[PDB]
């Protein structure tokens, strides 16, 4: 799921920059966003358990 | 809940006797105890009486430090009564009015302001104290500081204060800002006043003051139309209308500024309305100038300066001049602006009549060199006042817009429609004539 989502996020970042091609920096930012939000969800679940 | 009226009435005179004898400290201690009891009981009248009497006793002793400390302490006393604090502040304001020494007055006023800062019940008192402090600062010779102090206030919000007082405060703020040379701030402040106010019962002096301040503000940078409107408002006041000289000056200013204002629909309407006034007869020359600027014919700057040059600039004892075209730099600038207005009027008329003119002829008719006329026309075209096209190689100025085939055909159609309507009207008139002259 994370690998699928990072691709779409990189595409959207390329869209915002307004170019028809995805970039390595776009992929880096996409991973930084998706993995961080997944970690946020995990820690939220941990707090709910607490 | 527990009245102390009898106790306060019985005690206060004794405290006054002791205070005048010289028992200040003991009397203040006892009155403070009584005030504590009254505040706990929630006795508004008793607390107010105690506070006012204590302040009066401290005042009639020339104990200024004691007065200040007592006022601060009694204001900060826990669960104090707002009405009691208001009464104390009112009495202290009377005392501040009476006092004369400058630093003592300053310190007392500062303490009162610090006490009454941010409090709805005592806000008119703070406004009056701030006005007095600003007046004192200005008299001492700090106009910038007085303007800042008076501007810090926000009088449009105080719901308890009366409209007359609010308008007076706003006008004072405007005057101080103009004296400190802050025109943006002056305009922002002046926006507060509602012109509908100067119509109710007595808004005559305030109306005149406000309109004069607005005249100054606009005249700073040149707002001739608004200046004319302000002068019309001044001229409308019955106080000015009663005296012949005042209304005469007002009408002179109105006409002159309407002349000076650039051309537009509002300016034309104002000029027509001003001309349609019977009182103008008493100002004959100015009426002639208005007619000159309203008639659609060429006018000459030399002729205008020859005829009205002295009457509108130096004046005569029978009809005094006006500061519109004085000998100062403002008057010189206004004279130059009037010349520019004459040139613009000439250009507009020679555009209403004339499809094509030569640059030499336009300069000869505007009384300017070819280069100056070219610059004037170019500025007008760029500003979009009039339409013109300069063919520099041939020296021709074309005042007619391009004619599209749609435009030509539309003109032809309009002519045909007008012809048909005229035929119908002629037939109606013919029928009427035949009816009138045929039966007999």
């Amino acid at each position: 799921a994370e690998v699928k989502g990072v691709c779409t996020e990189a595409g959207m970042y390329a869209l915002r920059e307004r170019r028809v091609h995805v970039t390595q920096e776009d992929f880096e930012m996409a991973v930084a966003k998706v993995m961080q939000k997944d970690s946020e969800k995990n820690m939220s679940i941990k707090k709910l358990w607490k | 809940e527990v009245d102390y009226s009898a106790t306060v009435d019985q005690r206060l005179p004794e405290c006054a006797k002791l205070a005048k004898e010289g028992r200040l400290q003991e009397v203040i201690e006892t009155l403070l105890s009584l005030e504590k009891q009254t505040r706990t009981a929630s006795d508004m009248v008793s607390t107010s009486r105690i506070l006012v009497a204590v302040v009066k006793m401290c005042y009639e002793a020339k104990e200024w430090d004691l007065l200040n400390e007592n006022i601060m302490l009694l204001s900060k006393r826990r669960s104090q009564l707002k009405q009691a604090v208001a009464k104390m502040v009112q009495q202290c304001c009377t005392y501040v009015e009476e006092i004369t020494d400058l630093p003592i007055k300053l310190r007392l006023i500062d303490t009162l302001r610090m006490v009454t800062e941010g409090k709805i019940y005592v806000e008119i008192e703070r406004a009056r104290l701030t006005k007095t402090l600003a007046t004192i600062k200005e008299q001492n010779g700090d106009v910038k500081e007085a303007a800042s102090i008076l501007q810090e206030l926000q009088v449009e919000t105080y719901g308890s204060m009366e409209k007359k007082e609010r308008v007076e405060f706003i006008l004072e703020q405007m005057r101080l800002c103009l004296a400190v040379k802050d025109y943006i701030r002056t305009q922002i402040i002046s926006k507060k006043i509602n012109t509908k106010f100067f119509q109710e019962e007595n808004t005559e002096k305030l109306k005149l003051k406000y309109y004069n301040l607005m005249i100054q503000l606009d005249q700073h940078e040149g707002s001739y139309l608004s200046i004319c409107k302000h002068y019309r408002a001044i001229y409308d006041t019955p106080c000015i209308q009663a005296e012949s000289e005042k209304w005469q000056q007002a009408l002179k200013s109105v006409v002159l500024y309407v002349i000076l204002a650039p051309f537009d629909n509002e300016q034309s309407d104002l000029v027509h309305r001003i001309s349609g006034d019977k009182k103008l007869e008493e100002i004959p020359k100015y009426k002639d100038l208005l007619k000159l600027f309203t008639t659609m014919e060429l006018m000459r700057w030399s002729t205008l300066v020859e005829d009205y040059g002295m009457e509108l600039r130096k004046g005569s004892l029978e009809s005094p001049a006006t500061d519109v075209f004085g000998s100062t730099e403002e008057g010189e600038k206004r004279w130059k602006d009037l010349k520019n207005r004459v040139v613009e009027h000439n250009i507009r008329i020679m555009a209403k009549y004339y499809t094509r003119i030569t640059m030499k002829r336009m300069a000869q008719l505007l009384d300017l060199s070819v280069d100056e006329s070219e610059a004037f026309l170019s500025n007008l075209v760029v500003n979009k006042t009039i339409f013109a096209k300069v063919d520099r190689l041939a020296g021709i100025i074309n005042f007619q817009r391009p004619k599209d085939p749609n435009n030509l055909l539309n003109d032809w159609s309009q002519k045909l429609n007008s012809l048909m309507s005229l035929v119908n009207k002629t037939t109606h008139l013919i029928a009427k004539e035949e009816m009138i002259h045929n039966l007999q």
Binding site: M12, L15, V20, E40 | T157
Partner: protein, 278 residues
């Protein structure tokens, strides 16, 4: 006779007297959320010649989820105020109705009205009422609710990618939602609205106190720095109680004492854990 496109009972936003009064400026911070929301339902309306070039497909809807009181409905009101497209506001609890068929009929009518008014936004608040994951299929009530949800899914999938009809849905409990809603083609943009951090707290405090009087002695940085997990509603309530104390004491200026007391009143700390731990 064939009547005009819609008679309808699900009325459209009058957008002249029912238009909210919440600006974008009235909201403080949430720049990322504003970007995402105004991108997922205005960017496809614009452009679209970049969206396929990179192989990603435009999102049909947006799901706003977060704790209770961090700007969801406020942002919805802001977009309604500042958008020229037609607005169709609904609440999930409205779909469920006594008579069978009425719920699906209402969903269909809503989406048909949105289709008829070409650029339109459909906003369903508290979608948890309809999109609950669990269900007891031997009641009839639950069966009708499931029918409403299925009809909503069918309508949302039945889009041709050529009509500017976007759907926004706000839910405080995003875990309880049926995965079908999150399936691609349906809601695709999940925007989080978390409790403000230090910077968002500072911006919210500034934007809410810019209207109050706020005597100079008040330093909002001390309250921003405090490590309390509070929402924008909490911040607004802090300011509101400070103003209430000012009014009670009969002052038109707010003081640091009032702000401190309001913070204590509104951010009431939970029961303290005993010290023999730690």
């Amino acid at each position: 006779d064939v009547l005009p496109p819609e008679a309808d009972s699900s009325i459209m936003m009058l957008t002249s007297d029912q238009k909210p009064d919440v600006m974008y400026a009235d909201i403080g911070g949430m720049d990322i959320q504003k970007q995402e929301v105004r991108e997922a339902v205005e960017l496809p309306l614009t452009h679209f010649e970049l969206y396929k070039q990179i192989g990603i497909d435009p999102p049909r809807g947006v799901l706003m989820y977060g704790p209770p009181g961090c700007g969801k409905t406020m942002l919805a009101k802001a977009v309604a105020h500042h958008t020229t497209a037609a607005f169709i506001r609904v609440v999930g609890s409205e779909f469920v109705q006594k008579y069978l068929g009425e719920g699906p009929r209402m969903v269909r009518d809503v989406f048909r009205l949105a289709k008829e008014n070409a650029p339109a936004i459909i906003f369903i608040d508290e979608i948890d009422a309809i999109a609950t994951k669990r269900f007891d299929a031997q009641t009839g009530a639950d069966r009708e609710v499931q029918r409403i949800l299925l009809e909503l899914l069918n309508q949302m999938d039945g889009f041709d990618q050529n009509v500017n009809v976007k759907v926004i849905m706000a839910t405080n409990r995003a875990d309880t939602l049926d995965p079908a809603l999150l399936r691609p083609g349906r809601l695709d943009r999940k925007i989080e609205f978390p409790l403000p951090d230090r910077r968002q707290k500072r911006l919210i405090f500034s934007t809410i106190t810019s209207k109050m009087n706020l005597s100079e002695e008040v330093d909002l940085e001390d309250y921003v720095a405090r490590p309390d997990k509070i929402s924008g509603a909490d911040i607004n309530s802090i300011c509101q109680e400070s103003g209430m104390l000012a009014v009670r004491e009969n002052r038109y200026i707010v003081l640091a004492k009032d702000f401190e007391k309001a913070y204590k009143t509104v951010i009431k700390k939970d029961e303290q854990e005993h010290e023999f731990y730690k």
